[PDB]
């Protein structure tokens, strides 16, 4: 599977039947229908001990991996029960600035969408957590083109060394706090991973406030390849999945 014309999101239902499940993601967020739920606690992000380790091109995106052998970079509160550890973050972007994000707000598409993935510690490891309705907590942040994001530059500068699928590079001492927006107001709903196996084990937390990156910054995301060092060059762009039916789910907002 992939995002191409012949193995794209439209073909996934064949290998992964859950593609047509009840709590698939992403979805379009209707700001006027989402309900304000006063009982939501504020989000608690603790990334001061976060230990980044590696960045790799897995042929679908590039992941920054963190040491999740301990409670050093966690997410808590909000609609979450328990502690979730940060294991990795990656992005989804388009071939053009008018698209790229997975989630949409009132049908508006952003240039890209950042995903910070955490798993519920009560389940021992990531592998067991993705098998639970409440095993993962993904923090979604939209990116719009404008002013450059200083804290993201360390990432774009190394993209040259993991151009092709399979490549990885040491990536230590990266502070994920630099990617967060000023505010933490969010929308939340139960969903799934946006790429196969597409398991419905995620509690989505989408931040209302997007962050700004420069045209030159997102531009370097597009110079990556889906192919391995051998195959013909296939630029890595539009690796996002289209909105899925909300079905019988409700989107909660932590603000009004
Ligand atoms: Zn993602």
Short mmCIF file of C-alpha atoms and ligand atoms in Angstrom, two decimals, residues 90-92 102 115 194-195 204, ligand 1:
data_model
loop_
_atom_site.label_atom_id
_atom_site.label_comp_id
_atom_site.label_asym_id
_atom_site.label_seq_id
_atom_site.Cartn_x
_atom_site.Cartn_y
_atom_site.Cartn_z
CA UNK A 90 5.82 12.62 11.83
CA UNK A 91 4.10 14.86 9.28
CA UNK A 92 1.65 14.67 6.38
CA UNK A 102 -5.36 14.99 7.08
CA UNK A 115 1.23 13.95 14.52
CA UNK A 194 -4.47 7.21 9.41
CA UNK A 195 -2.23 4.63 7.74
CA UNK A 204 -7.49 12.18 18.76
ZN1 LIG B 1 0.04 10.57 10.94
#
